Short mmCIF file of C-alpha atoms and ligand atoms in Angstrom, two decimals:
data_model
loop_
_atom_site.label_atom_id
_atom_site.label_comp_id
_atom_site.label_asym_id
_atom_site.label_seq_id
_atom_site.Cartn_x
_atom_site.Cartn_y
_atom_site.Cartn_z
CA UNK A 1 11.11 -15.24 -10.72
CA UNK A 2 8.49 -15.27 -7.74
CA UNK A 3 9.45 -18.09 -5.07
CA UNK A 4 8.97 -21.49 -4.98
CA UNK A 5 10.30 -23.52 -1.96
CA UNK A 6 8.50 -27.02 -3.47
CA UNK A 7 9.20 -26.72 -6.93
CA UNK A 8 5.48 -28.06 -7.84
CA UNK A 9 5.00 -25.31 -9.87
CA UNK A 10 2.87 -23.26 -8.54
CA UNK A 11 3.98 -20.60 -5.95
CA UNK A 12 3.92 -19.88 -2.59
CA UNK A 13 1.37 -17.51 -2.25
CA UNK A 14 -0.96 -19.31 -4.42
CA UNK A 15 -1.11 -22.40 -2.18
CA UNK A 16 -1.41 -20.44 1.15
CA UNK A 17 -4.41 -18.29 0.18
CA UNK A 18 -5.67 -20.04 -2.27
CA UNK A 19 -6.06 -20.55 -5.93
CA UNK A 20 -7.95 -22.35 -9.26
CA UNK A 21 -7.32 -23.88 -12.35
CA UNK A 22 -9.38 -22.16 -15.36
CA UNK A 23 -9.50 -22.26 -19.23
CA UNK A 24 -9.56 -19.10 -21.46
CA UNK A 25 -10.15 -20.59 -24.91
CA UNK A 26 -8.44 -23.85 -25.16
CA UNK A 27 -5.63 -22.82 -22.70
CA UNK A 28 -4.88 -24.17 -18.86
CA UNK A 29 -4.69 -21.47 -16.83
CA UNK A 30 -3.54 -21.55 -13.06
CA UNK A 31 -4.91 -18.16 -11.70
CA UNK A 32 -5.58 -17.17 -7.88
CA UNK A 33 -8.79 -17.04 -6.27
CA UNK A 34 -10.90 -14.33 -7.58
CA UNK A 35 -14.46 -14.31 -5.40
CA UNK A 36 -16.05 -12.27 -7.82
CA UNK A 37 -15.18 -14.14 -11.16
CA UNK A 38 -14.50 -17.51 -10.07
CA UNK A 39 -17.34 -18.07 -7.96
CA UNK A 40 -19.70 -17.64 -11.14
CA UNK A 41 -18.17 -20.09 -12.92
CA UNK A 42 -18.29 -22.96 -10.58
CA UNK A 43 -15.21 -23.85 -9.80
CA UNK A 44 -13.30 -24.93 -6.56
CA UNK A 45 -11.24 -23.19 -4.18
CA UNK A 46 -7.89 -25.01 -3.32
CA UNK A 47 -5.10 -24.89 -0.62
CA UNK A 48 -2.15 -26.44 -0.14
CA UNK A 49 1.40 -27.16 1.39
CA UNK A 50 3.83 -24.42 0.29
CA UNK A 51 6.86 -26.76 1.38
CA UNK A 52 5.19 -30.37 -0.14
CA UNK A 53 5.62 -31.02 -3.05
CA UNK A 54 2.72 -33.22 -2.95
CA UNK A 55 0.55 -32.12 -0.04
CA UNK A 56 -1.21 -35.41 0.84
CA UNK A 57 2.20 -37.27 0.09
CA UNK A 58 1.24 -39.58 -2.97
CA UNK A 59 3.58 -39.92 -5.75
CA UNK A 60 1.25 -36.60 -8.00
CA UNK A 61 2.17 -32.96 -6.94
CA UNK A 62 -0.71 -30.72 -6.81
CA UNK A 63 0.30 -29.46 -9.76
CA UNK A 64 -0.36 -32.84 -11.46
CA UNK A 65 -3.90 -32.83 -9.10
CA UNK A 66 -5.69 -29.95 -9.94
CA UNK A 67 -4.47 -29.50 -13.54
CA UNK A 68 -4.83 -33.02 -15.17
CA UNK A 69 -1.81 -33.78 -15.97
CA UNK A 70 -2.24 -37.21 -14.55
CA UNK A 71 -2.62 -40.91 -14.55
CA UNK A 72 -6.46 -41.37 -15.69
CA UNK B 1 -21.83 12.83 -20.72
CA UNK B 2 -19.81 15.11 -18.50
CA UNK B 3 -22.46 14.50 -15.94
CA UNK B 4 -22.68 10.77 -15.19
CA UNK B 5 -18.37 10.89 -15.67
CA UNK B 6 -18.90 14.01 -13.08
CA UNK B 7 -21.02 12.13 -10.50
CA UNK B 8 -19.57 8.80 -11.12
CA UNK B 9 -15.35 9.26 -11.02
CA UNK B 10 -15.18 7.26 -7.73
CA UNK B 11 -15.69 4.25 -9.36
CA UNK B 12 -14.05 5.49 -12.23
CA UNK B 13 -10.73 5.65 -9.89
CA UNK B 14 -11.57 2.70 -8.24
CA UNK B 15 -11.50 0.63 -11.54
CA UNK B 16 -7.81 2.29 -12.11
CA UNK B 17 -6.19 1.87 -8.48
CA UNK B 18 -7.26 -1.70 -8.68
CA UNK B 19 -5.61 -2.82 -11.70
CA UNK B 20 -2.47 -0.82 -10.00
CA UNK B 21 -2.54 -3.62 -7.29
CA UNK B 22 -2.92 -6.57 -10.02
CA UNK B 23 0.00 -5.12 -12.26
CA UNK B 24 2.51 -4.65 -9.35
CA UNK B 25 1.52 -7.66 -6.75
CA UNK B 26 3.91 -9.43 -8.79
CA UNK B 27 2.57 -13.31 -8.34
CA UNK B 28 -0.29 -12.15 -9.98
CA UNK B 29 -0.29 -10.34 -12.91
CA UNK B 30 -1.26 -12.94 -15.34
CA UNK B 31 -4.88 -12.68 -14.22
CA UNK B 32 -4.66 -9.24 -15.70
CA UNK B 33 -3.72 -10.30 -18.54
CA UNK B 34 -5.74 -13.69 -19.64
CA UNK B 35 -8.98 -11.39 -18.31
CA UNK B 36 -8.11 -8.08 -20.21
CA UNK B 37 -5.54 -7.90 -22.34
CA UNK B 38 -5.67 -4.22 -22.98
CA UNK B 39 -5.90 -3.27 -19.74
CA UNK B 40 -3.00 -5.09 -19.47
CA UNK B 41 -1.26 -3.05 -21.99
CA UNK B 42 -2.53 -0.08 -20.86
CA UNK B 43 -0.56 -0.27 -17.63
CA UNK B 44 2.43 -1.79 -20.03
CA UNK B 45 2.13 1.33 -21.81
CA UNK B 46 2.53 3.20 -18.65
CA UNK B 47 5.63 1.22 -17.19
CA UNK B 48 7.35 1.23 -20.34
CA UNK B 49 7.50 5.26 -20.63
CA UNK B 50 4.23 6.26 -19.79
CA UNK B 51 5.05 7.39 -16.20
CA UNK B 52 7.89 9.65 -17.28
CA UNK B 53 5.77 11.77 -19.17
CA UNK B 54 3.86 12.17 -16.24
CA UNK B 55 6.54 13.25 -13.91
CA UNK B 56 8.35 15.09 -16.10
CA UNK B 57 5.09 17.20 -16.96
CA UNK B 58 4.89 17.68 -13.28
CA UNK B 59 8.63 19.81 -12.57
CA UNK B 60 8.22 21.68 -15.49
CA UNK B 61 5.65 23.15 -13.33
CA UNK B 62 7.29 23.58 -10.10
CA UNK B 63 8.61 26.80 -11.46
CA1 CA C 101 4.93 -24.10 -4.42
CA1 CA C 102 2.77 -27.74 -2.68
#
């Protein structure tokens, strides 16, 4: 079990250095910043709070944020 | 060719000793996996037994 002080599902080293959200064939996929194939691809580089569970203190964790799994 | 492999096993052993650091930095090794699966299982193959055939072979040696 890697840490998670939050318990917004993603860990802690993911939200201090930074991470993405990418799709392999129809599957979600929360992966860590890789400059070499993420870059390419066009998506976004994210940080967070490790200790928030929602950084920006709304009711949606970045979990919730950067995944979709959201109110439309 | 044994020539290009004999000129070229830097990067040969820096495509190996990088997927070392993805298999054993232990919040990520699920971008191994979902980006090559049988590299993946490769280094599965060496956790799971693999390295004891190579340190065994290695003693057996020190005679
Ligand atoms: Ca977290
Ligand atoms: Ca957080």
């Amino acid at each position: 079990t890697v840490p998670d002080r939050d318990n917004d599902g993603i860990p802690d080293s993911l939200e201090v250095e930074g991470y993405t959200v990418d799709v392999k064939n129809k599957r979600t996929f929360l992966s860590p910043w890789i400059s070499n194939i993420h870059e390419k691809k066009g998506l976004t580089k994210y940080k967070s709070s490790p200790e928030k569970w929602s950084t920006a203190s709304d009711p949606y964790s970045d979990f919730e944020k950067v995944t979709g799994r959201i109110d439309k | 060719d044994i020539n290009f492999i004999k000129e070229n096993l830097t990067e040969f052993q820096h495509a190996f000793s990088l997927a070392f650091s993805y298999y054993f930095a232990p919040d990520h090794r699920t971008v191994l996996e979902l980006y090559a699966p049988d590299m993946f299982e490769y280094m599965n193959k060496l956790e799971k037994g693999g390295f004891e055939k190579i340190s065994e072979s290695l003693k057996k040696e020190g005679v």
